[PDB]
Design a protein around this ligand. Structure first.
Ligand SMILES: Cc1ccc(-c2cc3c(NC(P(=O)(O)O)P(=O)(O)O)ncnc3s2)cc1
Ligand SMILES: Cc1ccc(-c2cc3c(NC(P(=O)(O)O)P(=O)(O)O)ncnc3s2)cc1
Lengths: 341, 341
C-alpha cells in the first residue's frame, strides 16, 4: 500500500497535533480543560486505520509537483489529514451517544466511560473545533485557507443532514419499512458518509495543490460519491455475510432496524407473503428471529445480487475514472478503488 | 430602548433566514431533513429577547457611516445578528441535554419533547452549521467574510472550553468546594458566557463596519469581558435574592452544586464552622436545606457585598469605557452598560 508507506509519518505527527492544541500555555486558568481536551483527542482520534486522513496525504503527493513538497507543505498535508480524522471523531463520539452504542472498535465508547456520560457532547464539539484551530495554526497564510475552512464546514453540514435523514428513516423503536426505499437509502449514504469519507479528503488535497476550479471539483465529486455509495453497500453486505473472522465483529444491522442495502433489496424483491415475514422479524433482539431474516435474504439470493452489483459497480467506477479524472492523474482515484474493491 | 426600535425588523427577518435555509429546493431527496431543520430552528431560536443578536444590529448602526447603510448592508446585519442567536441556540440545546434540564424559558427543552431525545445532539449541531451557511449566502463577497467565520469559530471554541471547565468544576453529583475558587469562577464566566455574549456581537459589528485592527478589538474585548463578568455575577445574585416576580423563575443554583459567585464569596468569608455547614447543605434537593444556605449567605451580608460590588464594577466599567472605547463612539458600550446595570 502507498498507505503503509506514509502511515508511520502520519501517526507520529499526531504527537505534534496534540502538543500544539495544548501549548494555550499562556493561559494557565484553563489548564484543566486543556488536559481534558488532550484525553478526548487521544481516546477518540487514535485507534483506527486512518484511511480518510492518509488519503489526504497520498493524494497530496500525487497532485503537487514534487519540487513543491518542501518539509512545511507536508507538515500541512499531515495536519489536514489529521483534520479529517478529527472531523470523523466528532461524528462518531456524537453518533455513539445518539445510538446508545456500547463499544467502538471493541473499545468502550467514550460517553460510556465512568465520569464522562453526556459531557461527551461538549467533548465531541471540542473535536470539531480543533479542526479550525489547526487550520488556522498551520494554513492561515496559504491561498487555500478559506477553501479548506468552507470544505470542512460544508462536510459537517452534509453529514449532519444525512444523519437527520437516517434518524427520521430508521428510528430505533419504530418498525416502518415503507420508509426504506432505494432513493432514501442512496440519499442517506451520500450525505451521511460519502461526502466526508471520499470527497472531502481528495478535495482537501486538491485545494492544497492549488486545484480549486469548480468543475474539477464537481468531476472528482461525481467519481468519489459513487465510490462512497459502493463502499457503504459493501459494508451492509459484509455486516451480515462477511466471514466474521476475515471482517471484524458480527453484524447487528437487522437487530437495529437499519436502512441497510440488504433490507432495501429484499423489499423490492418480495412476494406479499415475504413482506409480512419481514415486518414480523425485522428489528428484533432474538437470535433465531435474526437467523430467520438471514435465511429470507439467502433464499432471495441477495448474495448473488450483491456479487452482480459489485461487478457492475466496478465497471461503472472505471468508466467514471476514464471520463472524469482528467486532468488529475488517474491513480488518485485508482488507489482508492483498489482499497475498496 | 434603541433595542425596541430595531426589534420588530429583527424578528421579522427570521422568516427570511428560515426560507433561505430551507430553499436545498433543488435537492428533493433531503426534503424530510430540511423540514426537521425548520422545526428545530423555530422551536429553539425563537422565544427569548434577542439581546445578543440585536446588539449586532444596534452596534452596526452606530459604527457605520449612515450613507453606507444601504438595504443590503442591513439585510446582512440582521442576518449576522441571527447568526449570534443561532450560536446561542446550539449551546443551549446541547447544555440542556448535558444538565438534564426540564424546561428553558418555562418551555419544555427540545431534547425532552416526545420523539426527539438524544437526536437533539444532531439538531444542535445543525443549528451551528446554519451559521456558516448564512454567512456564506449573505456575506461571501464581503471583505469581512473570513473575519466573521473565524470569529464565530473562535466563539464556539471559547464557549466549549468554558463549558469543559464548568463541567470539571461542578460535576452534578460531587460536592467539592475546594474547586470553587475566585480564579476558577472568573475563568468559567469569561470563556463560557462573556466572549459569545458580549464580545462576539460587538466584534461582528466592528468587522462589518470595516474595523478590523487587532488593537481595536483587544480594546473592545477588555471592556466587554468585564461587562460579561458583571452580568453573570448579577445573574448569580438574582438567582437567589432576585425578587422572583420582577425576575423570572425561582433559582436552583445551590441545589445544583453550581459554581456561583455567591458560594465563591461565602467560602472566602467563612469561619471553619461555616465551611462545614456549607459542605453539609450545599447541593441538596431539600427546600429547608436550601433555605438554610440562603440564611448563611444572608448572615454573611453577601447582599451588601453584592451591592458594594455592583457600584465598584459600575465605576470600573465607566473608567474602562473612558480609556478603551476610542475611536469607537462611547455609546456602543454605554447602551450595553445601561441594559445590564
Ligand atoms: C477514503 C477511504 C479509503 C479507504 C477506506 C477503507 C476502509 C476499509 C476498511 N474499513 C474497516 P477497518 O480497517 O476495520 O476500519 P471499517 O472499520 O471502516 O468497517 N476495511 C477494509 N478496507 C477498507 S478500505 C475508507 C475510506
Ligand atoms: C449583549 C447583551 C445585551 C443585553 C443582555 C441582557 C439580558 C437581560 C436579561 N436577560 C434575562 P431575559 O430577558 O428574561 O432573557 P435572562 O433570560 O438572560 O436571565 N434580563 C434583564 N436584562 C437583560 S440585559 C444580554 C446580552
Amino acid at each position: 500500500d502507498v498507505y503503509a508507506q506514509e502511515k508511520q509519518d502520519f501517526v507520529q505527527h499526531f504527537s505534534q497535533i496534540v502538543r500544539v492544541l495544548t501549548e494555550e500555555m499562556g493561559h494557565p486558568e484553563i489548564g484543566d480543560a486543556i488536559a481534558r481536551l488532550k484525553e478526548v483527542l487521544e481516546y477518540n482520534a487514535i485507534g483506527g486505520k486512518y484511511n480518510r486522513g492518509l488519503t489526504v496525504v497520498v493524494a497530496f503527493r500525487e497532485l503537487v509537483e514534487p519540487r513543491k513538497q518542501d518539509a512545511d507543505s507536508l507538515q500541512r498535508a499531515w495536519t489536514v489529514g489529521w483534520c479529517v480524522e478529527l472531523l470523523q471523531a466528532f461524528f462518531l463520539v456524537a453518533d455513539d451517544i445518539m445510538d446508545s452504542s456500547l463499544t467502538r472498535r471493541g473499545q468502550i465508547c467514550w460517553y460510556q466511560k465512568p465520569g464522562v456520560g453526556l459531557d461527551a457532547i461538549n467533548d465531541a464539539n471540542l473535536l470539531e473545533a480543533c479542526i479550525y484551530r489547526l487550520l488556522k495554526l498551520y494554513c492561515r497564510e496559504q491561498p487555500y485557507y478559506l477553501n479548506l475552512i468552507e470544505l470542512f464546514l460544508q462536510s459537517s453540514y452534509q453529514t449532519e443532514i444525512g444523519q437527520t435523514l437516517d434518524l427520521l428513516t430508521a428510528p430505533q423503536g419504530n418498525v416502518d419499512l415503507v420508509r426504506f426505499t432505494e432513493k432514501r437509502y442512496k440519499s442517506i449514504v451520500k450525505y451521511k458518509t460519502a461526502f466526508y469519507s471520499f470527497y472531502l479528503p481528495i478535495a482537501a488535497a486538491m485545494y492544497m495543490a492549488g486545484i480549486d476550479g469548480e468543475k474539477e471539483h464537481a468531476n472528482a465529486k461525481k467519481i468519489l460519491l459513487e465510490m462512497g455509495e459502493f463502499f457503504q453497500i459493501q459494508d451492509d453486505y459484509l455486516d451480515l455475510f462477511g466471514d466474521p473472522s476475515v471482517t471484524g465483529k458480527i453484524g447487528t444491522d437487522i437487530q437495529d432496524n437499519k436502512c441497510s442495502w440488504l433490507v432495501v433489496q429484499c423489499l423490492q424483491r418480495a412476494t406479499p407473503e415475504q413482506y409480512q415475514i419481514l415486518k414480523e422479524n425485522y428489528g428484533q433482539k432474538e437470535a433465531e428471529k435474526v437467523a430467520r431474516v438471514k435465511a429470507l435474504y439467502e433464499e432471495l439470493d441477495l448474495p448473488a445480487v450483491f456479487l452482480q452489483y459489485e461487478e457492475d459497480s466496478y465497471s461503472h467506477i472505471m468508466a467514471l475514472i476514464e471520463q472524469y479524472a482528467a486532468p488529475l492523474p488517474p491513480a488518485v482515484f485508482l488507489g482508492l478503488a483498489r482499497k475498496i474493491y
